[PDB]
Design a protein around this ligand. Structure first.
Ligand SMILES: [Zn+2]
Lengths: 97, 178
């Protein structure tokens, strides 16, 4: 589960929608199954057929592991304040002198 | 009966546009796109309960403005009929038995659920291969025209729809969504 920034709020539950599965034990459609009209047959004279749809849930941390964002989002100008104590500047200054 | 007035078969379908107005969201034209042998019966069964007011010919039907229709659900067709099985004292009179059946002021269930607000006559099928404009299944025959002429219900009729909703005085509660 990808994230985008540091304080990105997250849901504890991830609902999922799945197609119903045959198998002749539960050959009849269950009670908690809804019907969706999204079985395509044709497209130019568009034709759709019913399809039984089941619903389940998932929980973050036990099935899906939360990932982290890559790169840098917030952009700031460099604006490096000059320092007169590090070694590199102390040698560059003597070289200029 | 075969009235002399001729109308396109797409007038019985609300979602498919007809003469005048516009034709966006459904790219068809009159008398060139037809209906198969099931969608015509679909349009025929929609007559008694979803007939709009219209322009000239204001008289819509037994419910005038179509109201909300509420009914109890189930998970099977035989099961669905059981919840909404409410027989009345008198089962009216048949209205689809080939008789126009001019009744009295008081009407019944079999004469109310099968109302015919408009005289309708479907023409013979035309050979071909194209699909219809409602369900889109390719077929062999289609119907391209019909004879529709408006008819007004008698005024002051007494009929309470079993599945209707009324506000305070029998006026239909429609959906005020725009
Ligand atoms: Zn059709």
């Amino acid at each position: 589960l990808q994230k985008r920034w540091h304080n990105e709020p997250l849901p504890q539950i991830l609902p999922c929608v799945m197609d119903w599965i045959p198998g002749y034990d539960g050959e009849h459609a269950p009670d908690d199954a809804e019907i969706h009209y999204d079985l395509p047959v044709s497209f130019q004279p568009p034709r759709h057929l019913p399809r039984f749809v089941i619903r389940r849930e998932l929980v973050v941390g036990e099935d899906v592991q939360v990932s982290r964002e890559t790169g840098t989002s917030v952009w700031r100008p460099k604006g490096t304040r000059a320092d007169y104590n590090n070694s590199e500047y102390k040698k560059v200054r003597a070289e200029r002198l | 009966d075969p009235s002399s007035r001729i109308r396109a078969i797409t007038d019985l379908i609300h979602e498919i546009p007809t003469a005048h107005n516009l034709c966006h969201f459904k790219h068809v034209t009159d008398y060139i796109d037809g209906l198969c042998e099931a969608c015509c019966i679909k349009g025929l069964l929609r007559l008694p309960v979803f007939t709009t007011v219209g322009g000239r010919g204001i008289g819509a039907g037994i419910n005038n403005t179509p109201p909300f229709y509420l009914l109890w659900h189930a998970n099977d067709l035989a099961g669905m009929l059981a919840q909404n099985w409410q027989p009345w004292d008198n089962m009216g009179i048949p209205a689809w038995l080939g008789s126009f059946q001019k009744e009295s002021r008081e009407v019944g269930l079999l004469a109310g659920m099968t109302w015919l607000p408009r005289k309708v006559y479907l023409h013979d099928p035309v050979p071909g291969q194209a699909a219809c404009c409602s369900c889109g299944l390719p077929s062999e025959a289609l119907v391209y025209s019909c004879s529709i002429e408006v008819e007004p219900v008698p005024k002051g009729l007494e009929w309470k729809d079993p599945h209707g909703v009324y506000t305070d005085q029998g006026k239909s509660l429609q959906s005020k969504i725009k």
